[PDB]
Every structure is written in C-alpha cells, then in structure tokens.
C-alpha cells in the first residue's frame, strides 16, 4: 500500500543521509586517533628518557655520600 | 513477480539492517573504549603534573 511504501522510502532516504554523516565522523575519528597515537609514542619515549636521566642523576649523587 | 520483487527486496532490507546493527555496535564499542581511556588519561595527567612539581622543587 502507498502510505507504507512512502514511509519506507522516507525512512531509507533518512537512514542514507545519516550513513553519510557516520562516514564523515568515522574518518575524523581515525585521523584524530592517528595523531594522538604518534603523540603517545613521543610521550612514552620522553618518559623513559626522563626516567633514565633521573636515575642517572641520583646515581651520580649517591657517589657524593 | 510483484510478490517476487517484494520477497527479494525484503531479503536485502534484512541484510541492510544487519550491517546497520553491526555499525551501531562498533560506534557503541568505540565510545566505551574511548571513555575508558578518558579515565586512564586522567590518572596519567595527574601523575605527570605531580612529577613536574616534584622535579621543579628539587632543582
């Protein structure tokens, strides 16, 4: 019947438009995560480098005793 | 043939709902995942901010 068919058609038109937004959101998400993953990698590296220098400074100091 | 196109159209509707449902479940998983990591980053930010204060006072 045509009230059913028309509604099914508006629903699908509406789903489609929203799938288009979801694609755009998923892509931005992906990019932001790639950028934060690189940033996390620089943080890990810098934290480990920081901890080595902390331990070293302390070990040099412990010779002062 | 009228019934025939409704029957195959119906199958494809169901196939489309399955994918949409899978897509919805990923979008929920992602948000749970990111929210969880929101909380791990709160603690890291806290631990770091205090290590900053420590090192600064000690020098």
């Amino acid at each position: 019947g045509s009230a059913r068919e028309n509604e099914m058609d508006e629903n699908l038109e509406q789903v489609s438009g929203i799938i288009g937004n979801l694609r755009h959101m998923a892509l931005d998400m992906g990019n932001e995560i790639d950028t934060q993953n690189r940033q996390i990698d620089r943080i890990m590296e810098k934290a480990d480098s920081n901890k080595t220098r902390i331990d070293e400074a302390n070990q040099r100091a412990t010779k002062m005793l | 043939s009228a019934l025939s196109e409704i029957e195959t159209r119906h199958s494809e509707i169901i196939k489309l709902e399955n994918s949409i449902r899978e897509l919805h479940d990923m979008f929920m998983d992602m948000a749970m995942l990111v929210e969880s990591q929101g909380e791990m980053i709160d603690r890291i930010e806290y631990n770091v901010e205090h290590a900053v204060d420590y090192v600064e006072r000690a020098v």
Binding site: A26, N37, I40 | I20, V34, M40
Partner: peptide
C-alpha cells in the same frame, strides 16, 4: 538506491573496524 546504502554502510563498518583497532593499540600504550 537500496544498493548504494548497503555498500555505504559496509564502508563505514570497515572504517570503524580499523579505528577500533587503533584504539585497542592506544589502550595498550596507556
């Protein structure tokens, strides 16, 4: 027009699966 939707959705699915893989990776770095 139905067909353009099935393929459109399965593309986002593929994209969200990669994204979820990156975030399991980001979970491992934290």
């Amino acid at each position: 027009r139905l067909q353009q939707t099935q393929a459109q959705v399965d593309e986002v699915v593929d994209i969200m699966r990669v994204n979820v893989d990156k975030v399991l990776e980001r979970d491992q770095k934290l």
